[PDB]
Design a protein around this ligand. Structure first.
Ligand SMILES: [Zn+2]
Ligand SMILES: [Zn+2]
Length: 210
């Protein structure tokens, strides 16, 4: 059927919980969705969730689950200039990467050492955050979810008030979320970005240096 339901089922198939997003509130259908970073909803809730998604609801994937976190970059073209085409392609060759509805890129990874607390933004350029690590108490919309930008009136949306719809799509091809050495990755990004005005945030460098 739809890509939205296919990918939602694919995440569940791999042991990751998902939660429907209410069409109106644009927030998870359950207020206490954070519990899904540590336990499953059970057969009942699951079927109910899948029905909402099949009927058209978008869905989200809570971070932190089984050591899975999502590096949420605001701009894909910026990352390409940042680490280079070769580095980006290799990274997305080894793990799942997706295009966001605003031109960003989500890189899903598994890590044995997840920050015990929020250290966002990870990096900044010209005094502003350009990437956030989505871990516990956060989520990202999943593949197939679509957003109509007509109601977006902030400068965070490039498509401000446009009668235009975009969706979360695969960067290249569907691939398993694989393990990465998070701290080693961040050091690579730090080294590559210094010559482009991209630097780690105070809290990020803190954790990175222990
Ligand atoms: Zn928007
Ligand atoms: Zn698999």
């Amino acid at each position: 059927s739809s890509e939205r339901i296919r990918y939602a089922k694919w995440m569940l198939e791999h042991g990751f919980n998902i939660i429907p997003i209410d069409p109106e509130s644009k927030k998870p259908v359950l207020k206490e969705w954070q519990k899904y970073s540590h336990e499953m909803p059970s057969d009942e809730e699951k079927q109910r969730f899948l029905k909402m998604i099949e009927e058209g609801y978008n869905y989200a994937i809570p971070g932190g689950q089984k050591g899975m976190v999502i590096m949420d970059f605001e701009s894909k073209e910026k990352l390409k200039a940042w680490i280079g085409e070769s580095a980006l392609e290799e990274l997305c060759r080894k793990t799942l990467c997706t295009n966001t509805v605003h031109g960003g890129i989500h890189i899903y990874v598994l890590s044995n050492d997840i920050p015990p607390h929020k250290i966002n933004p990870l990096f900044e350029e010209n005094g502003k955050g350009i990437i956030d690590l989505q871990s516990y108490n956060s989520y990202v919309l999943g593949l197939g979810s679509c957003v109509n930008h007509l109601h977006c009136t902030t400068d965070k949306c490039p498509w401000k008030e446009q009668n235009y719809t975009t969706c979360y799509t695969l960067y290249n091809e569907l691939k398993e979320i694989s393990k990465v050495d998070l701290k080693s990755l961040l050091r690579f990004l730090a080294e590559k970005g210094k010559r482009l005005g991209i630097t780690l945030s105070k809290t990020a460098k803190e954790w990175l240096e222990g």
